[PDB]
Amino acid sequence: VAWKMTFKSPEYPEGRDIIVIGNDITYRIGSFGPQEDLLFLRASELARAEGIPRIYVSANSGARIGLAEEIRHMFHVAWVDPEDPYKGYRYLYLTPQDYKRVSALNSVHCEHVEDEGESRYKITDIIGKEEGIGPENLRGSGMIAGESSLAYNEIITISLVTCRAIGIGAYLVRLGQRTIQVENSHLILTGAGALNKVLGREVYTSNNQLGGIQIMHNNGVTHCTVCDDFEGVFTVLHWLSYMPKSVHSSVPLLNSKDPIDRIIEFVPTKTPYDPRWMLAGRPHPTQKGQWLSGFFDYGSFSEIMQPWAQTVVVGRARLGGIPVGVVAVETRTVELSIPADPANLDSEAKIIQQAGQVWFPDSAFKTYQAIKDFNREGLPLMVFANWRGFSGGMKDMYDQVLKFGAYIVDGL
Amino acid sequence: LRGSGMIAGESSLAYNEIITISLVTCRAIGIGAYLVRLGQRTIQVENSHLILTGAGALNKVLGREVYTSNNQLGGIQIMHNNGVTHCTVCDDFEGVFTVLHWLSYMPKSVHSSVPLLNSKDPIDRIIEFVPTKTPYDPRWMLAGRPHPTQKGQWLSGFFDYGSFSEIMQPWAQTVVVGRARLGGIPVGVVAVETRTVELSIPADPANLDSEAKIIQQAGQVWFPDSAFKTYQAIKDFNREGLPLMVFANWRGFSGGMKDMYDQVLKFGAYIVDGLRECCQPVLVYIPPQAELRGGSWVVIDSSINPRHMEMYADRESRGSVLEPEGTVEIKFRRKDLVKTMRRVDPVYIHLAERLGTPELSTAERKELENKLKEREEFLIPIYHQVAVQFADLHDTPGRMQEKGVISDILDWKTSRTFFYWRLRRLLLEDLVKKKIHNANPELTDGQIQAMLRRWFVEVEGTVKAYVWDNNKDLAEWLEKQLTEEDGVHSVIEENIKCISRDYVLKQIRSLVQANPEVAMDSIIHMTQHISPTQRAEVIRIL
Amino acid sequence: QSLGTTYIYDIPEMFRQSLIKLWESMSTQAFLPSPPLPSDMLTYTELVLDDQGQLVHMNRLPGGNEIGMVAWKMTFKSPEYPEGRDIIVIGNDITYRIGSFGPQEDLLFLRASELARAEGIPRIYVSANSGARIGLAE
Amino acid sequence: TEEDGVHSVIEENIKCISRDYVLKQIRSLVQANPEVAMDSIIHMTQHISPTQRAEVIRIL
Amino acid sequence: IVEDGGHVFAGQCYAEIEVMKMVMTLTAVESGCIHYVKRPGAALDPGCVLAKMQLDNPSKVQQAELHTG
């Protein structure tokens, strides 16, 4: 289901538009047919036409699958030997009575044969009379993959995973780049059962091991996590209060209650410090009903990627009610937890001290992603620069950190 | 510093505009290193090293003499094993040899076509090596191999003997990518490792916990590394302007804890963007005994770039949203197995007919029923095997083609000749479409496709339509139209000139409609040269 | 050589000789005309900075460099391009101030690259160096 | 902020610059393609003041 | 890799399987006439029964269970 929606907000009182699309898992467990794919396509095409954002609520069971029941209930086996089936079989076939009806209808392709005296119809191709369970969904999918890549390059796209997004749904979510994940949801391509059978035992018991917020929020696949849909939407509108209605429009200005001609009470030190104190302020140690003012407007800072790559701190804020993008640097050592691979009994969970004032692979990648996203939105940037160098150790070098430095260069 | 940043940016643009290559001879330090990566294509001489900050400084900062030589940090044993370095050489001479050898595939400039050779390897030959369901070294498939018995002959591969020059060979060896020549046409090349790779993970000497792990990496899967390597290769060749030949064979993405943690999904998205920006033909072929499933098809459907993509399948190839076991798991349970016996199996049918008799002793009932369960249970596995075959029969090319999602079913033995000639006209036609697009950028791909074929049918006759599907005849025909300058061949060119004139007229007309005040003065300049007859006629129609 | 590398000004004849080896090897793969004579295979022109940091085409004797970087425009006839093709080649000179990167070196790089972009042809950089120039007021 | 006032001065100057830039484009176009000129005039001449038409004959 | 009713040796391979995505030599350990029991492709767990065989050296008597509470 999809709608065009327009609403009046504090920042845009005359109104602003978005397009919202969402799965209905109750209609055929949310499988993906050609009409569903087309609705997505045409809504996206219009979204691109006006330059306004596209929100996709993904809660689904991936591509539709099926087998022709009508044939399932009438096929026969051409045994090598009936008195022993286990010496293998050659083919399945239909009597001429069963063949003479499907034959007209582009359901299967058979060839007539004479064998053991009787006339049989050797089944050569299964075409399948039921529309919507075939590779047309694949064509539609590629189509919207390309289209969606362009959409991401044209407007703000955001996606919300409520219960589960499977396969290609996930891929649209990543292409949307900005991703909200409700707690207790999970995100997978192939199921634990299938994988366990391939591996000959029940290694994994729950999709949450693979795709929960504890994976995607800790690795930057998920931008925000929420306890419920309501808290997701609340976060959405809160972010949107920083963002321009369209690309043809100026940043929305507020008359903020935090004055412009005030001083900053916190004073930076050689000693390390929480940069959130530096940005947003902190409570006063003695008075405690007072507030040690930060650089930015009180209550305006909204972080992203908080639990992933914690050597750098990035987010959005407001300066006199003007939304800005924000970059700051962690100065205290991070203690990073790497989980153990339960599949491999050798693999153990390392625990790493991560020095401050250094760019790592993760930080550089996260940084490239943030800079590009805000940059394609049209936002100003504020960098609080404090870097001693690049990390030059074996692991990060092996992991190609140099490459991603080149990438940041292209982006800016 | 200013100068350096300045040329960093400039170099990024250069990489997006021309071919950049870098040679590491002795050592590259700092900005030099950064320039080397920005050059992207990198050859590295033995005993060179690649570093930012020196071992002395780092050891002092770290309180002990951890490292003894920059080579520990930046040598070929790191950059060649991770794909930072594209090729390694023993000396500068061998470096330059590699440079010119690569260059023999590449166009002098971006306005120029790939340089074509007349190769000594003929086009209408057969491939002697035949791929098998059993795994095999793909080097035999590509480059050929020596004959096992006579040993002085050569079992031919798909591509021209001696033409294949690999890249990224020791890094992420589950996939193999490179450049080759088919009849002297340079192409980009993608192939798939089928045997399990044994990967060596080096030890971190700084950290006493890290030990060198050894990982089995299944074949027919895209990993993070593979996807990254693929994104870089596809983009680079794409920025050169080459068509692609893919020997496609992927079962799926690895969905295990490690690769999922390591963000394989992200790099899949990136490959998608990259090919969407690709501007020349991509030809994907699933070879015999390969299979292609779900996500991998979805992410390489021709719809993404219909203008440029094509897909082909061998009779003995296979492809679906879902493999048989998982389809079966959902749509072939016990109920269906018993049901199938009830329709087809004589023992079950007969026995069931007898259980369907009235007034039997419950003794007789239970004994028959047990005999039935024993027959059934003993029979269940085989009948499952039949089920998977049944499912597999749904996955064929016939259906794909009928719905129009694939272009043709090929035959391996003669697939080479076909693809050569087919590519040659697909490519040439594309070159012409570029010429047309230059003549008028506003025309859509659809309309651009259109009219060229129609002008051909107009000139050569509706009766001759069928010729269009013959690669050779149009190719030879197209060349005469193209090659004879100032002949009777600049017909399509003359028509294009008319179209250009029309497009120009629309631009001036629209411009004056938006800006009528400019008209009068524009005339004086426009009137500045024209025939005297035109001046008089103008007064007549005034 | 004592530093385990190649002198900057010896590169051109080693590529030409290599080109001969290539002309030989490629004849395996294709039917080719007879190769041209080595003097006629290649012409190079040294690129040199004027006072204003602007490019000047120069035919001078090797060794005249006053900075640690050298560049040329090169045109040559090859089996694939017998009528000729152009490239730009830049290389460090490790003997001038341990191959450090001064403003003149950076500027030379800039203007050569800018011209390379102007004609659309490839840029080959031979890197063997010691990074940014450093010093203190003695 | 003041639409259609005496404040759209720099804007008016820019409008003149835009007009000039357009004129150079058409002029360059005719230089590369003078044969298209004559018919372009008829369309260009289709509306303009009558005085300009007469004066044009005078300077013809 | 054999068939029913085939004599085998000690230490002679009799099957080969794919476990954890990897091969495994099912080495036979005693000589005699095999009758292949567990038909292929089925998942199996440790301590399962895959075959019987008639050996060439029969041996001592075997179990007779009698104890019950």
Swiss-Prot record, chain D:
Tell me where on the tree of life, at the top rank, the source sits: Eukaryota
Coiled-coil residues are none
Cellular location(s): Cytoplasm, Cytosol
Name the organs or tissues of expression: Expressed in brain, placenta, skeletal muscle, renal, pancreatic and adipose tissues; expressed at low level in pulmonary tissue; not detected in the liver.
Q: What modifications follow translation?
A: The biotin cofactor is covalently attached to the central biotinyl-binding domain and is required for the catalytic activity.
How this chain assembles, per its entry, is: Monomer, homodimer, and homotetramer. Can form filamentous polymers. Interacts in its inactive phosphorylated form with the BRCT domains of BRCA1 which prevents ACACA dephosphorylation and inhibits lipid synthesis. Interacts with MID1IP1; interaction with MID1IP1 promotes oligomerization and increases its activity.
Disease connection: Acetyl-CoA carboxylase-alpha deficiency: An autosomal recessive inborn error of de novo fatty acid synthesis associated with severe brain damage, persistent myopathy and poor growth.
Domain annotation text?
Answer: Consists of an N-terminal biotin carboxylation/carboxylase (BC) domain that catalyzes the ATP-dependent transient carboxylation of the biotin covalently attached to the central biotinyl-binding/biotin carboxyl carrier (BCC) domain. The C-terminal carboxyl transferase (CT) domain catalyzes the transfer of the carboxyl group from carboxylated biotin to acetyl-CoA to produce malonyl-CoA.
Its function, per the record, reads: Cytosolic enzyme that catalyzes the carboxylation of acetyl-CoA to malonyl-CoA, the first and rate-limiting step of de novo fatty acid biosynthesis. This is a 2 steps reaction starting with the ATP-dependent carboxylation of the biotin carried by the biotin carboxyl carrier (BCC) domain followed by the transfer of the carboxyl group from carboxylated biotin to acetyl-CoA.
Put simply, this protein is called Acetyl-CoA carboxylase 1
Native organism is Homo sapiens
Gene that encodes it: ACACA
